Subunit: 258 residues, 4 copies
Amino acid sequence: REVIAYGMPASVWRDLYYWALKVSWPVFFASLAALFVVNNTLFALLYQLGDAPIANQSPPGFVGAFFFSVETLATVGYGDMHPQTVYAHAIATLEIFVGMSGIALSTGLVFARFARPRAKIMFARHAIVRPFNGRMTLMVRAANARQNVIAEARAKMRLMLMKIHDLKLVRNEHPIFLLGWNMMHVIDESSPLFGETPESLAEGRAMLLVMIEGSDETTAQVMQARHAWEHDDIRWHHRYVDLMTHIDYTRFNDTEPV
Amino acid sequence: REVIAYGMPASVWRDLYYWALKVSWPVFFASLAALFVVNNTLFALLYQLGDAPIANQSPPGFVGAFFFSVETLATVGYGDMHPQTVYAHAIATLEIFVGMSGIALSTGLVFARFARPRAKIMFARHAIVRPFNGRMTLMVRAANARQNVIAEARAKMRLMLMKIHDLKLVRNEHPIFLLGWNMMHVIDESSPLFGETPESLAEGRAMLLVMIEGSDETTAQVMQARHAWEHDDIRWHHRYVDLMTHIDYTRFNDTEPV
Amino acid sequence: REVIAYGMPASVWRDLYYWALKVSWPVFFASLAALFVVNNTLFALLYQLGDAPIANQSPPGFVGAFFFSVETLATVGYGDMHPQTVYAHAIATLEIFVGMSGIALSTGLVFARFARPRAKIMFARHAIVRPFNGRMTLMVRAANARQNVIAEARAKMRLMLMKIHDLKLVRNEHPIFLLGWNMMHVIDESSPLFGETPESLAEGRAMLLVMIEGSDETTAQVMQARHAWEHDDIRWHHRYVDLMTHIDYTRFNDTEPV
Amino acid sequence: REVIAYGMPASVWRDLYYWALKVSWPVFFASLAALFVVNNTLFALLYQLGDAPIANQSPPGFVGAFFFSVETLATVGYGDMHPQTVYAHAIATLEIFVGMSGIALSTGLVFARFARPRAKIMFARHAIVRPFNGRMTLMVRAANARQNVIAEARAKMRLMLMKIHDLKLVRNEHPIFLLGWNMMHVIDESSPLFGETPESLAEGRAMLLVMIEGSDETTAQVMQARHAWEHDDIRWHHRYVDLMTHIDYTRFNDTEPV
Ligand SMILES: [K+]
Ligand SMILES: [K+]
Ligand SMILES: [K+]
Ligand SMILES: [K+]
């Protein structure tokens, strides 16, 4: 329900909403569909019972109530009235409620899926540490990916487990006018990544953690994304292939030493 | 409507929405159901009146309009037209509006319940004060519980009533990359929990108050949770049983002295 | 559309949503109702036209299409089919779309009204300036009013027009565990309300401006409220009648000199 | 999909929601309408097929199923039952689902459009730099434009590309009680716009960038707006025509030297 190995409390139900809002839009509707079917049968197989018959329609039996059902659960009432007997009515009433209620939770999950924040921030499969305007400085570079932003990013660091406050891999600029961002930080004394070697990190399970946060002007939702680099991912003495006016994005991740 | 003894202004109505969005999902739908019924009768008992009859259907009387009603309030129109007389029509029109409108407020409360933030932060039934990397420091440890976060926590303290600003039981890190958080604070001079003994607190109704706040990347809602420790809950000279790679929360709360 | 005298750009439409989400819930539904009617007529009076008749129902003429209409706009289809002629169909189709669409915007405004933040912060009709634990200090006191919070408040000040940064009428505590809050600030040198008399303010159109901001744990919406005091409202050398365990709220605003 | 020249990954679908929530409200509904039509045909042209006929209604052929269709997709069930044959039923069932589902995504996009933040911040077509209370200071002035706020604004500056941290064109007040805001900043040493002339900027493609951010108390959405001034837009040695008690925005933009 989380990131590497969990044993805690859970409950089918919620786990379900999860899928509801994480699945693809066809797999979604299919999901309903499949449920529509299952929910149309269970009511049909509850019609061929009772104190009297139902399917006063074209279909002889079952296939009647079914196509009857698919006229009430969804509440379309088409026009072949089977309000013939009480038991018969009840069932049909119990249905009407449901489907009406069902349409809700569906129209419901729908909006809930729409509401999923909509922008996404993509980060460089690889970090890099190079010499810059003087001293040694680290670098990570991310960028928008659909409906822009204009964010601020904090940048934390993990070794040993103590999570050290690294001058925000923004250390130079905590924010920016995002439509191409190159987050970076000087490794001078002040910094905790001082005298530390690729060998130094490696042993401390060292991790570079970054999170950009910005609001989507289009929906004003403030959506934040995070990203983690494993020590062996910080590729040394390199740089990012230039990308640009226009930016072309294919080679975003690659690097080359210096 | 609040925490220990209130006497103030109020108004039924809202108090209701409350329940709407705090009750269990069956108790919910039942609620509607029950209301559906009540709302189907009141319209039926408004049919057996007027200038003319209604139930031109299977049911002789009442049980007719009812099962008629449950064809309009929900708006299913099935197919036994009782638009026979004016008065008869009106009633049926007044209905149609309603139910149509009713379905709304229901589909409505629904989304409003979905929208309830969805993550929850769980805290250690017990605080703890132990020696760490040198001096005496307090500790509380909380963790996610369904759809993660990545929050910041302030930590306040109560004795006596003056609520003292304790260097955020985050004093070391006001935030973190939450998926296991261990909030803690050094008790040196600067700190207000300095020279204070289990006996010292006890008399001041001393309380440890903590609140983590973070946004759910999945819905971007910023949901905060709080938690209070009673002085006799801060268990001294202990530590938290280790929990981890994997974390097994089963033993999240336990501790063992040092 | 704003607070004392405006002349700018506007547009009926939006001004309308305004009312939609500011009116009372009956005035609301009435609003629709009234619109339902108006929207049922305009379609009826568009039926008694065309290439052929419509009202093949109980009502002789008009009152027929109407009660017909109120069977389609809302989309209930009851059961007296007037799909007799093309023109006749069209009209009925144009309708079906609408009402279906209309039900939307209605179910729509509905949720939009629900979504109105739900907590409200009430402030003391009167500020007060009294001597406290030593020096002269100002004071304002607000409190919840339905579904609590736990907020932080900034406090600004206006004279001359320059809006001076007054050590947040929280100057002592920028936040609190809100369920009765008494915001206050020392008037020592540091403070801009230093040597200033009721006569001093009065001439500078002096204003005390306050805003509390907190999140509603129940909906996680962060709702802020503001409040302004006119110089002659800061009542001097007084205090707030005590109010309290339980708080009883009737005399919240009153004061008495010292 | 962005601001000057892009070449990157994408996918129709989302690009669509975009339009959904950016188009005008008629162009909207038209959009649906047009789709209603297209979606009514494709089902009709799927009726004149199968193992048996359909249009047992007024219209001889096609125009029958169509007006039939427009009775089910929308789910109105009017009353000329064509549940005559299986194939015939299926088609009609496949429809019912859809339209029911379709109404959702529509009621859906609807709320999603409503939810578009609703306030907007307007800025002075022209900046200005004048002498104030002593030294030379810059100035920009913005103001609400429908449902107020109460925001905080950061103010950045561009020359050359290095984006210099200018003491927030709020440098005097980072916030305010917005209902007329006049953002300004002293140009002393500390400031990066020090000794720089209209000629100095011009060559560095100099840009004044501002962004106000505040929450709409009415919906608690925090909506931010931005605005950029081209160096030749900062009009020197001027001021803003006064606007006020009442403010008449008609003359919001104008200025006059000093
Ligand atoms: K119907
Ligand atoms: K019917
Ligand atoms: K019907
Ligand atoms: K019929």
